[PDB]
Curated annotation (Swiss-Prot):
GO cellular component assignments: pilus
Designated name of the protein: CFA/I fimbrial subunit B
Pfam families: Fimbrial_CS1
InterPro entries given in the database record: Fimbrial_CS1-type
Family statement drawn from the similarity comment of this UniProt entry: Belongs to the fimbrial CS1 protein family.
């Protein structure tokens, strides 16, 4: 006889799996120590493959990787090598007819060495043929070789970095728009011929972190198509894989994530917003997806303004007229409006310091100042104005209160006789706060007054 067995004495396996690592994109070689078992230990051993072995994709016959076979430190082919008996080590083994250990090595890699294998399930047969002498006593060991390359698909930035897990959309309070996130992307895949199918897992929404019901719709496009929960197809030809490439890296494709108020012509409400763009990319027939989750956020800063009802700033100089006939000051009166983008919050109004009309050249005799707003008297301790009561809906533009009267009347200190004569000055500090929010408007009004004893 001639036989080829494992060095332990077991029969050669009829099957071999070549483990694939997607990290290195290579197959681990099968190695096994063997011995020739012979009738005749002086005869040469002629070793060949019956056919040139290939791994072939079970699904597609044109995709093939060559198998490489070595035995005894010699690479095998359909051309036979003759092993002289002397360096098979027949006396080393301690068993008659039995060689020393010879390594069998079965490897696979792509025909173009240094490139990555295409996705697929691969099979083929290695047919090891061994003879003696001039002979036709001939052993054939057939070893079914298997390998799997699982479909891989990734979406990367065009510098090869991962897409970010979070994105901020900058808000302009002037144009009342959010600036779109835009990034240049490339598909990386080991199955480049397949169509890429692109969906969102759910309809993305920019949602007020503190109110479920307050939403702005997010728009996502990739490669010049607006995406939805309904899948869109990108043919491999349309994705611009270079003919000179096989890393399966697409042409650069732009991803755009946009948001806008649900209704055109309107301002977003103050607050912090978020939702998740769940991008889903499928290889056509391979049943494999990558999901990319990108958290999208936006901040609409709370804003509060107090203006005259005509939209002018309040004055930074008020003068109160004196009648000596009635011995009393005429009040300053002005219609004002609160302009806000958080028109559910309570508005908190107070005075920052307590105002006086101080005498100009001696800083002693002082005529302190009454301030009223919205039909409510003001102190340095605050009055609460509920949002319903400011009547933001009741009037005209959204987020502008109906007209509230600001009344500033001085009538000095102790009551029911004439004030003392003199020229007077001072400063009203007014403070408005959008409640719970961390937002303050200060408005300083310089008050001046005259009593002159040279008139009636
Ligand atoms: Mg834009
Ligand atoms: Mg390349
Ligand atoms: Mg009056
Ligand atoms: Mg009296």
């Amino acid at each position: 006889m001639i036989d080829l067995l494992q060095a332990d004495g077991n029969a050669l396996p009829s099957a071999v799996k070549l483990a694939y690592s997607p990290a290195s994109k290579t197959f681990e070689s099968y190695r096994v120590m063997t011995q020739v078992h012979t009738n005749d230990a002086t005869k040469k051993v002629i070793v060949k493959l019956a056919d040139t072995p290939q791994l072939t994709d079970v699904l597609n016959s044109t995709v093939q990787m060559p198998i490489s076979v070595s035995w005894g430190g010699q690479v095998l082919s359909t051309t036979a090598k003759e092993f002289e008996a002397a360096a098979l080590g027949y006396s080393a083994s301690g068993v008659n007819g039995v060689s020393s250990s010879q390594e069998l090595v079965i490897s696979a890699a792509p025909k173009t060495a240094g490139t990555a294998p295409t996705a697929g399930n691969y099979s083929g047969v290695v047919s090891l043929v061994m003879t003696l002498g001039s002979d036709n006593k001939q052993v054939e060991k057939n070893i079914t070789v298997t390998a799997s390359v699982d479909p891989v698909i990734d979406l990367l930035q065009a510098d090869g970095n991962a897409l970010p897990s979070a994105v901020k959309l900058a808000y302009s309070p002037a144009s009342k728009t959010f600036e779109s996130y835009r990034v240049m992307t490339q598909v990386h895949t080991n199955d480049a011929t397949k169509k890429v199918i692109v969906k969102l897992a759910d309809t993305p929404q920019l949602t007020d972190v503190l109110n479920s019901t307050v939403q702005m719709p997010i728009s996502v496009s990739w490669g010049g198509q607006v995406l939805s929960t309904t899948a869109k197809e990108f043919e491999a030809a349309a994705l611009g894989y270079s003919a000179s490439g096989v890393n399966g890296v697409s042409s650069s494709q732009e991803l755009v994530i946009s948001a806008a108020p649900k209704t055109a012509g309107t301002a977003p409400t103050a607050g912090n917003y978020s939702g998740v763009v769940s991008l889903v990319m499928t290889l056509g027939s391979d049943n494999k997806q990558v999901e990319k989750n990108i958290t999208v956020t936006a901040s609409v800063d709370p804003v509060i303004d107090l203006l005259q009802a005509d939209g002018n700033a309040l004055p930074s100089a008020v003068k109160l007229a004196y009648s000596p006939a009635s011995k009393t000051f005429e009040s300053y009166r002005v219609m004002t409006q609160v302009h806000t983008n958080d028109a559910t919050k309570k508005v908190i109004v107070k005075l920052a310091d307590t105002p006086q009309l101080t005498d100009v050249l001696n800083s002693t005799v002082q005529m302190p100042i009454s301030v009223s707003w919205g039909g409510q008297v003001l102190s340095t301790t605050a009055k609460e104005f509920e949002a319903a009561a400011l009547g933001y809906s009741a009037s005209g533009v959204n987020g502008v209160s109906s007209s509230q009267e600001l009344v500033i009347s001085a009538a000095p200190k102790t009551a029911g006789t004439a004030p003392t004569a003199g020229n007077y000055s001072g400063v009203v500090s007014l403070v408005m706060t959008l409640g719970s929010d961390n937002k303050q408007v200060e408005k300083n009004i310089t008050v001046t007054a005259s009593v002159d004893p040279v008139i009636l």
